[PDB]
Design a protein around this ligand. Structure first.
Ligand SMILES: O=C(c1ccc(OCCN2CCCCC2)cc1)c1c(-c2ccc(O)cc2)sc2cc(O)ccc12
Ligand SMILES: O=C(c1ccc(OCCN2CCCCC2)cc1)c1c(-c2ccc(O)cc2)sc2cc(O)ccc12
Lengths: 242, 234
């Protein structure tokens, strides 16, 4: 993994991209605002399975222990859902494209108590992507950075010092990769550094939205909010029988 | 105008703007639970010095008062935390809230819900330590937190463009520092990225800290709009 070129890094990330899923309901029937959370929950749950298989294709990720793979996904899963949402919504001002058949605006967000504030933050992030003219190759680098970065500070065993050093090396490679993309695009050295910072600073906002969103989901008092250790392990820990 | 400062002038302005290190307010002859009262009192006194510092960050006072207040509302606990982490850098295993208030994680356990965030703060300090973070870099990072934390949640696009122009100059300033220190272009990029990724962790800690503070049902957690505006002293 640490021997990939920038071009190989981009290529592997582009190839790992998960599909765009649809909301599960009959589109010949009228839409009901009262079904919204149900629809969003079912969508998130199905997306999680594809997220696990995307994560396994992120260079350097399966080199980690399964325990650490689980912890990174525990920390990052809602951030990853959210940056994916923002990316899908970038070309639809004022809207959030949860699915091609589930395109919502903030007035619809208002029907769920406590949701509109987060809605508004997601919309502003989509606006920022648009203002920056964020490219696909840049987007997949950012999403991989979220996966590797978000949980790396909340995990001192010898094996684990080895894990953190590996993560930091892979992160350095993704930085090189972003710079390569920007250079190949024709940006000056000054413009490369400035845009690199602009991209990375957005990740602080994505982390903020993830924490506000998590607090919001917990406030709904559903039985199931986060993916369990066991659920994630089961999905991550495949046998070699297939 | 602020946008015309050189990288060297930006660094000097930020170093000179640095706030003082305050002490905890307690009688050291008296027996030492009341931990939260001490920390609350400390943070409350730190805030006015934070406002004086923000007014000295180049470009900040070119914003409307309304927008200055919004930025401080968003950033104040992050700023207190990166300050704590910086002060704690040479004290492995402990958090230097003040020179007369140096606590370890065992003392953090005495307050329900605190030790998890305590541990995150200690880890961030260790990361700064291992990166050999310099004072010149620290004051750039802290200025970035002030300008960046609220910029995605706001004439208004003129204000945002201004903020992003100032952020760009601080990026330029960070790179300049690293170049003078003899880092290669590759190392310059990589170090900039490593520093900015730590800011996501600091945002995370601020979020969890805020939840914790709210979970204690205290008199009040966030500084009000009116308090901040008053301290800005129009
Ligand atoms: O609405 C959701 C959402 C709903 C349920 C979720 O989790 C359901 C619990 N489930 C339990 C098993 C493990 C996986 C999660 C997650 C997101 C989405 C979001 C959200 C927005 C605002 C807010 O205040 C809270 C969340 S963002 C998002 C992106 C998606 O691709 C899908 C759903 C979503
Ligand atoms: O303990 C505090 C703290 C206590 C009270 C605070 O706010 C009190 C409310 N006050 C109201 C008027 C405006 C200012 C805030 C803020 C921080 C500090 C921190 C903390 C750590 C862990 C955790 O779970 C929660 C907080 S971090 C910190 C750094 C400081 O320089 C000072 C206090 C602190």
């Amino acid at each position: 993994a640490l021997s990939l070129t920038a071009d190989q890094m981009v290529s592997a990330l582009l190839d790992a991209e998960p599909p765009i899923l649809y909301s599960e309901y009959d589109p010949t029937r009228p839409f009901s605002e009262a079904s919204m959370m149900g629809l969003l929950t079912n969508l998130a749950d199905r997306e999680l399975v594809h997220m696990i298989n995307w994560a396994k294709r992120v260079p350097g990720f399966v080199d980690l222990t399964l325990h650490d793979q689980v912890h990174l996904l525990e920390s990052a899963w809602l951030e990853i859902l959210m940056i994916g949402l923002v990316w899908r919504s970038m070309e639809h001002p004022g809207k959030l494209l949860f699915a091609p058949n589930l395109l919502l605006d903030r007035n619809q967000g208002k029907s769920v108590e406590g949701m509109v504030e987060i809605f508004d933050m997601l919309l502003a992030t989509s606006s920022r992507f648009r203002m920056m003219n964020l490219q696909g190759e840049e987007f997949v680098c950012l999403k991989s950075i979220i996966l590797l970065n978000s949980g790396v500070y909340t995990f001192s065993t010898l094996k684990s010092l080895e894990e953190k050093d590996h993560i930091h090396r892979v992160l350095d490679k993704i930085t090189d990769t972003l710079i390569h993309l920007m250079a190949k695009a024709g940006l000056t050295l000054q413009q490369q550094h400035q845009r690199l910072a602009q991209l990375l600073l957005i990740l602080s906002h994505i982390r903020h939205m993830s924490n506000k969103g998590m607090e919001h989901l917990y406030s709904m008092k559903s039985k199931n909010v986060v993916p369990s250790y066991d659920l994630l392990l089961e999905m991550l820990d495949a046998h070699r029988l297939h």
